[PDB]
Amino acid sequence: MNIFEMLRIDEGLRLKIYKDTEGYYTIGIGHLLTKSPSLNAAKSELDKAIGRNCNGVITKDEAEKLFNQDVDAAVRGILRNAKLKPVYASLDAVRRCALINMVFQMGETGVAGFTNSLRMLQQKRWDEAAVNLAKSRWYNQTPNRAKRVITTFRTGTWDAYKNL
Ligand SMILES: [Cl-]
Ligand SMILES: [Cl-]
Helices (H) then strands (E): counts for the chain:
9, 3
Q: Where are the domains of the chain?
A: 1-164
- Please report, for residues 4, 25, 44, 128, 137, the alpha-carbon distance to residue 148 in angstroms, rounded to integers and kept in the order given: 15, 24, 34, 16, 16
90 annotated to a ligand binding site: no
This PDB structure is determined at a resolution in Å of 1.8
The amino acid at 75: V
Q: Is 155 exposed, middle or buried (0-12, 13-18, 19+ CB in 10 A)?
A: middle
Q: Are 11 and 30 in contact (CB under 8 A)?
A: yes
Give Rg (Cα) of the chain: 16
- In the residue annotation, 159 being an active-site residue is answered as no
Would residue 22 show up in a list of annotated catalytic residues for this protein?
no
CA of 108 to the centre of ligand 1 (A): 20
CA of residue 129 to ligand 1 center, whole Å:
14
- Look up residue 53 and give its amino acid: N
Question: Could you say which of 11, 62, 70, 108 is catalytic?
Answer: 11
Experimental approach taken: X-ray
Q: Kindly give the distance from the C-alpha atom of residue 51 to the centroid of ligand 2, in angstroms, as a whole number.
A: 32
CATH of 1-164, one of 1.10.287.310, 1.10.132.20, 1.10.530.40, 3.30.499.10: 1.10.530.40
**SS3 (DSSP) at 13:** coil
50 class by beta-carbon count within 10 Å (0-12 exposed, 13-18 middle, 19+ buried) = middle
